[PDB]
Design a protein around this ligand. Structure first.
Ligand SMILES: O=Cc1ccccc1
Ligand SMILES: [N+]
Ligand SMILES: [N+]
Ligand SMILES: [N+]
Ligand SMILES: [N+]
Ligand SMILES: [N+]
Ligand SMILES: [N+]
Ligand SMILES: [N+]
Ligand SMILES: [N+]
Ligand SMILES: [N+]
Length: 119
């Protein structure tokens, strides 16, 4: 939603940027340090992500237009994708969040046309 986007653009140094905000409202998130932190900010604010507990897969399932329990294969595939990113070894919190987000990026794109992954 606009609110969280506006707030995160202010919370993140450099993110209050016309050209980047154009991408963000268009659901594109370039692989750059400002966007990394912006993506982290949105994940934290929407309760989709946590620096320690990783991705909440049920919350993302629901953010993808579902109101039911996540499909088992959705959970399994993303848990595996996320484990493969070795997030706990990424020291920079924004880079870690962006890397975790990359596991869900396609789901969000297909949609656009708690199940913490690290309990
Ligand atoms: O901030 C990281 C993140 C991860 C998964 C979904 C949304 C955001
Ligand atoms: N902004
Ligand atoms: N952030
Ligand atoms: N949060
Ligand atoms: N959540
Ligand atoms: N539900
Ligand atoms: N549910
Ligand atoms: N359930
Ligand atoms: N399932
Ligand atoms: N991981």
């Amino acid at each position: 939603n606009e609110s969280v986007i506006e707030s995160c653009s202010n919370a993140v140094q450099g993110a209050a940027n016309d050209e980047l905000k154009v991408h963000y409202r268009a659901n594109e998130f370039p692989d750059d340090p400002v966007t990394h932190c912006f993506v982290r900010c949105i994940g934290l604010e929407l309760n989709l992500y946590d620096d320690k507990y990783g991705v909440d897969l049920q919350a993302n399932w629901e953010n993808l237009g579902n109101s039911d329990d996540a499909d088992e294969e959705f959970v399994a595939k993303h848990r595996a994708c996320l484990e493969a990113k070795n997030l706990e070894t990424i020291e920079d919190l924004c880079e870690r969040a962006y890397s975790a987000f990359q596991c869900l990026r396609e789901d969000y794109e297909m949609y656009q046309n708690e199940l913490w992954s690290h309990p």
